[PDB]
Design an enzyme around this catalytic site. Sequence first.
Site, PDB file in Angstrom:
ATOM      1  N   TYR A  28      -2.700  -7.730 -11.063  1.00  0.00           N
ATOM      2  CA  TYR A  28      -1.970  -8.485 -10.040  1.00  0.00           C
ATOM      3  C   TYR A  28      -1.103  -9.584 -10.651  1.00  0.00           C
ATOM      4  O   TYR A  28      -0.036  -9.894 -10.133  1.00  0.00           O
ATOM      5  CB  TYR A  28      -2.916  -9.049  -8.964  1.00  0.00           C
ATOM      6  CG  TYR A  28      -3.728  -7.963  -8.305  1.00  0.00           C
ATOM      7  CD1 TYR A  28      -3.131  -7.060  -7.423  1.00  0.00           C
ATOM      8  CD2 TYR A  28      -5.079  -7.798  -8.608  1.00  0.00           C
ATOM      9  CE1 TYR A  28      -3.863  -6.033  -6.851  1.00  0.00           C
ATOM     10  CE2 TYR A  28      -5.823  -6.777  -8.031  1.00  0.00           C
ATOM     11  CZ  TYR A  28      -5.208  -5.903  -7.155  1.00  0.00           C
ATOM     12  OH  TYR A  28      -5.936  -4.894  -6.577  1.00  0.00           O
ATOM     13  N   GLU A  47       0.818  -1.212   0.000  1.00  0.00           N
ATOM     14  CA  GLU A  47       0.000   0.000   0.000  1.00  0.00           C
ATOM     15  C   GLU A  47       0.850   1.260   0.000  1.00  0.00           C
ATOM     16  O   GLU A  47       0.477   2.264  -0.609  1.00  0.00           O
ATOM     17  CB  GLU A  47      -0.943   0.019   1.209  1.00  0.00           C
ATOM     18  CG  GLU A  47      -1.955  -1.129   1.248  1.00  0.00           C
ATOM     19  CD  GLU A  47      -2.857  -1.156   0.026  1.00  0.00           C
ATOM     20  OE1 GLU A  47      -3.251  -0.072  -0.457  1.00  0.00           O
ATOM     21  OE2 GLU A  47      -3.165  -2.265  -0.450  1.00  0.00           O
TER      22      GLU A  47
HETATM   23  C1  LIG Z   1     -11.496   5.290  -4.789  1.00  0.00           C
HETATM   24  C2  LIG Z   1     -10.002   5.569  -4.976  1.00  0.00           C
HETATM   25  C3  LIG Z   1      -9.230   4.255  -5.155  1.00  0.00           C
HETATM   26  C4  LIG Z   1      -9.299   3.429  -3.859  1.00  0.00           C
HETATM   27  C5  LIG Z   1      -7.766   4.457  -5.579  1.00  0.00           C
HETATM   28  N1  LIG Z   1      -7.591   5.496  -6.620  1.00  0.00           N
HETATM   29  C6  LIG Z   1      -7.126   6.708  -6.325  1.00  0.00           C
HETATM   30  C7  LIG Z   1      -6.941   7.661  -7.511  1.00  0.00           C
HETATM   31  O1  LIG Z   1      -6.866   7.073  -5.182  1.00  0.00           O
HETATM   32  C8  LIG Z   1      -7.198   3.136  -6.119  1.00  0.00           C
HETATM   33  O2  LIG Z   1      -7.544   2.705  -7.219  1.00  0.00           O
HETATM   34  N2  LIG Z   1      -6.292   2.556  -5.343  1.00  0.00           N
HETATM   35  C9  LIG Z   1      -5.672   1.262  -5.692  1.00  0.00           C
HETATM   36  C10 LIG Z   1      -4.197   1.439  -6.046  1.00  0.00           C
HETATM   37  C11 LIG Z   1      -4.081   2.165  -7.388  1.00  0.00           C
HETATM   38  C12 LIG Z   1      -4.098   3.561  -7.417  1.00  0.00           C
HETATM   39  C13 LIG Z   1      -4.001   4.236  -8.631  1.00  0.00           C
HETATM   40  C14 LIG Z   1      -3.885   3.516  -9.815  1.00  0.00           C
HETATM   41  O3  LIG Z   1      -3.786   4.193 -10.997  1.00  0.00           O
HETATM   42  C15 LIG Z   1      -3.870   2.118  -9.795  1.00  0.00           C
HETATM   43  C16 LIG Z   1      -3.970   1.438  -8.577  1.00  0.00           C
HETATM   44  C17 LIG Z   1      -5.872   0.377  -4.475  1.00  0.00           C
HETATM   45  O4  LIG Z   1      -5.937   0.880  -3.359  1.00  0.00           O
HETATM   46  N3  LIG Z   1      -6.005  -0.917  -4.720  1.00  0.00           N
HETATM   47  C18 LIG Z   1      -6.336  -1.877  -3.663  1.00  0.00           C
HETATM   48  C19 LIG Z   1      -7.660  -2.544  -4.081  1.00  0.00           C
HETATM   49  C20 LIG Z   1      -8.756  -1.513  -4.400  1.00  0.00           C
HETATM   50  C21 LIG Z   1      -8.826  -0.935  -5.673  1.00  0.00           C
HETATM   51  C22 LIG Z   1      -9.815   0.012  -5.962  1.00  0.00           C
HETATM   52  C23 LIG Z   1     -10.737   0.372  -4.976  1.00  0.00           C
HETATM   53  O5  LIG Z   1     -11.699   1.289  -5.270  1.00  0.00           O
HETATM   54  C24 LIG Z   1     -10.670  -0.195  -3.702  1.00  0.00           C
HETATM   55  C25 LIG Z   1      -9.676  -1.138  -3.416  1.00  0.00           C
HETATM   56  P1  LIG Z   1      -4.992  -3.098  -3.485  1.00  0.00           P
HETATM   57  O6  LIG Z   1      -4.599  -3.646  -4.793  1.00  0.00           O
HETATM   58  O7  LIG Z   1      -3.760  -2.271  -2.840  1.00  0.00           O
HETATM   59  O8  LIG Z   1      -5.448  -4.156  -2.360  1.00  0.00           O
HETATM   60 ZN   LIG Z   2      -2.501  -2.632  -4.683  1.00  0.00          ZN
END
Ligand SMILES: CC[C@H](C)[C@H](NC(C)=O)C(=O)N[C@@H](Cc1ccc(O)cc1)C(=O)N[C@@H](Cc1ccc(O)cc1)P(=O)(O)O
Ligand SMILES: [Zn+2]
Length: 581
Positions: A480, A345
């Site tokens: 993944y 993370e």
């Molecule tokens: C509602 C916002 C999102 C939670 C976030 N996006 C932003 C712009 O904050 C996001 O896509 N984050 C990705 C990690 C990721 C971030 C950006 C990327 O371009 C790709 C992946 C993330 O936290 N992924 C987790 C799973 C996840 C992915 C999308 C979600 O909405 C909720 C959970 P992980 O694989 O670490 O277990």
């Molecule tokens: Zn992730």
Amino acid sequence: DEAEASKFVEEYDRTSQVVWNEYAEANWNYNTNITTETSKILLQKNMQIANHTLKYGTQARKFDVNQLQNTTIKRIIKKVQDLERAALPAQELEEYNKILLDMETTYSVATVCHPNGSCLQLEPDLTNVMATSRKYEDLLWAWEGWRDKAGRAILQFYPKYVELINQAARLNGYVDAGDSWRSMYETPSLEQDLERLFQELQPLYLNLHAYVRRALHRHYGAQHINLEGPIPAHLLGNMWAQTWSNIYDLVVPFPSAPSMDTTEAMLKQGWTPRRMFKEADDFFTSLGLLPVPPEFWNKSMLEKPTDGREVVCHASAWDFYNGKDFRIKQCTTVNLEDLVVAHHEMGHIQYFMQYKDLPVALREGANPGFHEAIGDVLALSVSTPKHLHSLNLLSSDEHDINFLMKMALDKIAFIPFSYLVDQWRWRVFDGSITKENYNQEWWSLRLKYQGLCPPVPRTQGDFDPGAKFHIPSSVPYIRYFVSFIIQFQFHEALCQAAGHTGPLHKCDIYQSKEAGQRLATAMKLGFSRPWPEAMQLITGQPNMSASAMLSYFKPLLDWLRTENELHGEKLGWPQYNWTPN
Ligand SMILES: CC[C@H](C)[C@H](NC(C)=O)C(=O)N[C@@H](Cc1ccc(O)cc1)C(=O)N[C@@H](Cc1ccc(O)cc1)P(=O)(O)O
Ligand SMILES: [Zn+2]
Ligand SMILES: *[C@@H]1O[C@H](CO[C@@H]2O[C@@H](C)[C@@H](O)[C@@H](O)[C@@H]2O)[C@@H](O[C@@H]2O[C@H](CO)[C@@H](O[C@@H]3O[C@H](CO)[C@@H](O)[C@H](O)[C@@H]3O)[C@H](O)[C@H]2NC(C)=O)[C@H](O)[C@H]1NC(C)=O
Ligand SMILES: *[C@@H]1O[C@H](CO)[C@@H](O)[C@H](O)[C@H]1NC(C)=O
Ligand SMILES: [Cl-]
Ligand SMILES: [Cl-]
């Protein structure tokens, strides 16, 4: 035409920052506080961001991308022409947003209850049962219970979800939602590329599968394990049998070389979720990479609230689109597994900070696999016996093979799972799999790729894919698989950059400024260039390749082949039609 184009991009980027920041706030508030109120505010903010997307997307489509000189402007405008869900008619859009909210909420609040009284949540209760219980019936109760309560409840929403996400995809110029998703890689040969990579890891997976199957046969009895068939899906230490590291104690190659109980060590020494993320922060800064801002510590949710609050527990990292505000939301348990998750993370946070100065349209990973890989690369070094001993969590060739086995249970076992999730979803999206055979086809792939069978026969009404977070949350999964391949390529390249010799699995890049620099330059590119460029910057070559992963596990492959041959294992599951009697 060029002047109007750059002006458009400038206006798009400054307005997007504001509206996306607002949306992220409302989304965060719901995720960390599931209530009727936060729900309504979120759905309202969904309309607002849709209004913005529609406005700018409609403008973007009036530009002839073909006539634009500047490639960065060209790239941004092309991307803004894709409205995502905002392409849907107003009524369709509100229904879609409600469906997504309903699926996410259903998954995150699902519980499995004992008749007598006690009700278990997935995190940490059911996760703990799957990780620690060595009783066939107890694992079955948790496994079946989760699918009965979470999976079945998602089924009512899924066909409409598929209809709407596909409709949005077609309205954005794709044939279906899977097409739209795959396009994120900008790689026309993607499906073949991933197929070849999957095939290269077959010898390693099949040998691991056979060895673990033999160890399960020993523990759970000859009547419950077919040595020529698939493995019952509830015996691998994980709810989804996606990673097998929790059954290490059942499969340890050299039990005469025991390892320190890391969980007991962390707890006795007073590790907290806060300390776990601080250690991840330290590893990033040791490489010369950025520390998380003070605001991160103030605003993140690093443990499950005792507030009485209902939350989405699944770990996530959040970019608030202002270059200052970055957060993690995780129901952290104090154990080695979540220490690795913490690093994962934190890699997402590092990526956000590295590309923060780019226009928001390009504030993404080189491809989604890259975003997932960063934290994992560092975690490979964290996981070394050398680094774990330095953290006081651990204390010969036997220990070496033991370590490689431990790593294989995580990394190798995940390869077929991470491959199959979107193999299933792409066929759902393209119409090959209909609601009449959602589950049947899921299990066909669970058999074909992972060599697993369900411990209990599935019935009509079962929707086992719904029991995996990313399905009701509409989060693509192929990222993944890509991550797991490329993280080893990155590891190998950074270890060489750090001047390390000897076996790849012994490398620990802690404190290497040379390693940090290579990662930083690639991360700074964000989504501004096609991913092969970022690959080139890290590895000195442009391809995805299984070679580094194969090199890492080579000593284990040798040992496994010797072990399996002497025990007379028939690799694979030729009797694929086998299910528990
Ligand atoms: C509602 C916002 C999102 C939670 C976030 N996006 C932003 C712009 O904050 C996001 O896509 N984050 C990705 C990690 C990721 C971030 C950006 C990327 O371009 C790709 C992946 C993330 O936290 N992924 C987790 C799973 C996840 C992915 C999308 C979600 O909405 C909720 C959970 P992980 O694989 O670490 O277990
Ligand atoms: Zn992730
Ligand atoms: C094509 O256009 C891009 C982007 O142009 C930028 O955004 C537009 C919407 C307009 O607002 C433009 O006025 C604006 O420049 C150009 O890429 C940009 O190139 C410049 C100069 O090389 C980069 O500036 C650098 O920035 C860093 C950090 O601030 C400084 O340390 C450097 O010294 C240097 O000034 C800028 O970062 C870069 N932007 C992006 C997003 O990549 C590009 O040059 C242009 N292509 C051609 C062939 O002209
Ligand atoms: C949770 O949501 C309610 C409104 O539904 C709000 O009043 C409350 O302050 C929130 N709790 C926290 C800790 O923010
Ligand atoms: Cl399943
Ligand atoms: Cl993806």
